[PDB]
Amino acid sequence: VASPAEFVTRFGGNKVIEKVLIANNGIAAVKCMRSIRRWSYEMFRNERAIRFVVMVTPEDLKANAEYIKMADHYVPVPGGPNNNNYANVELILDIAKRIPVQAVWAGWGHASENPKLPELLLKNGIAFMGPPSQAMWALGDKIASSIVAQTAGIPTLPWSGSGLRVILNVPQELYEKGYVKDVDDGLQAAEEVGYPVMIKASEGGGGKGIRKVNNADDFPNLFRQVQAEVPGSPIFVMRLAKQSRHLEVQILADQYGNAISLFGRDCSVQRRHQKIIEEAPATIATPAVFEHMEQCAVKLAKMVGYVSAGTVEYLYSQDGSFYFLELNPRLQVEHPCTEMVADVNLPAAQLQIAMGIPLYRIKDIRMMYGVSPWGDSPIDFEDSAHVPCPRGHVIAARITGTVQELNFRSNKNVWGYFSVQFGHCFSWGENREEAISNMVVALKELSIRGDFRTTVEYLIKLLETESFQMNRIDTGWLDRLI
């Protein structure tokens, strides 16, 4: 194809996107540009075919943040906390309208989980490379998403909104039974479910507004803390589960009702609720149980009219039981785990979906389902469920300008980045053992650096432990290892 406009016609889309505004910074802004520009070179032999507009804070400009010079165009925005810049929906819209751009990519963090952003963009004829307003609330809000999950017949752990049920919508009166309007209704909910409990803000993102509660005397101040951490957000109470496996299903949906899973990720290796090690695929679950978890994830996405990328998170037990925990209405930082085993470029798929390209017209998806790479033949994703199989294994490891891309001479199958704080290394292998081995050697090469001496040791130690090698870990594993 000669241009984005020709691509849209040839591949059956309905919206020409030549310019995208990035409502983010750091690795997110860099990853979106790198992934899309690679796809653009493959399609148009011009990596700049889809132009990128970036938002620049005085802080990011003073730091000489790499995403600024990478961008085709940059826009200085007001400094300070993200509510004045990156997370300011009114500012994002104003810039989108002014250039103008044809789509917005929010990534992870900032305004990526604010349902007003796609709402205002749609009103102005601007696409959002993420779910529509409706689907983002009913699946992103924790109380509402658990009610949708229950409506779909997906199991959930005992919580303040247990028993509640009914394209779908959760009415405010039903929703209001699931939440704890005050500390007193909360104390009551905690007593019904039974201690130990979790007080959780439903609008909380990245582990914010969550408190572990062992007894009723501790409850009120812990409730007051959750209110203070995520102000304005409704609050719910849930049973604090036993040590389990934390699993994720990667979802991808177009604008036409087609939604698929891109296998799963195991994110059980956690330290103070922070995801430390991720793996793709999620080998711990029984193939039949994981297939069920995948179908539930697709049903749940289809029910609310979900579009773009999403993550369905589950708590899994050795019993073979699983419980819906939440839906992440955006791309995650650990998404390359999936990209590598599924051979799906996630930001490019988000772009194509926003251009109205059906899933069956995306080369990556066609290949995944074993059909012609350039054909227009519709795919029955339900009938070809056994057809996709992961290509090898990936291990992701959390490590502790603004973005330094870290290249390894020890391995061709390992890559990473360090941000300014934390970063991630990604190791592919033909199988799990082969992927852990490459990670160790890469972390050992990384160990030769000064700043990465102490930090990489505990990771090398955890990766070599018999429990990890034998995949006999759980959510409480790391926290008791120290």
UniProtKB/Swiss-Prot annotation:
Expression tissues: Expressed in brain, placenta, skeletal muscle, renal, pancreatic and adipose tissues; expressed at low level in pulmonary tissue; not detected in the liver.
Location in the cell: Cytoplasm, Cytosol
Residues the entry annotates as binding Mn(2+) 1: E313, E326
Post-translational modification: The biotin cofactor is covalently attached to the central biotinyl-binding domain and is required for the catalytic activity.
Described purpose of this protein according to its UniProt entry: Cytosolic enzyme that catalyzes the carboxylation of acetyl-CoA to malonyl-CoA, the first and rate-limiting step of de novo fatty acid biosynthesis. This is a 2 steps reaction starting with the ATP-dependent carboxylation of the biotin carried by the biotin carboxyl carrier (BCC) domain followed by the transfer of the carboxyl group from carboxylated biotin to acetyl-CoA.
Domain notes: Consists of an N-terminal biotin carboxylation/carboxylase (BC) domain that catalyzes the ATP-dependent transient carboxylation of the biotin covalently attached to the central biotinyl-binding/biotin carboxyl carrier (BCC) domain. The C-terminal carboxyl transferase (CT) domain catalyzes the transfer of the carboxyl group from carboxylated biotin to acetyl-CoA to produce malonyl-CoA.
Protein name: Acetyl-CoA carboxylase 1
Gene source species: Homo sapiens (Human)
Segment of the intact protein contained: 102 to 617 of 2346
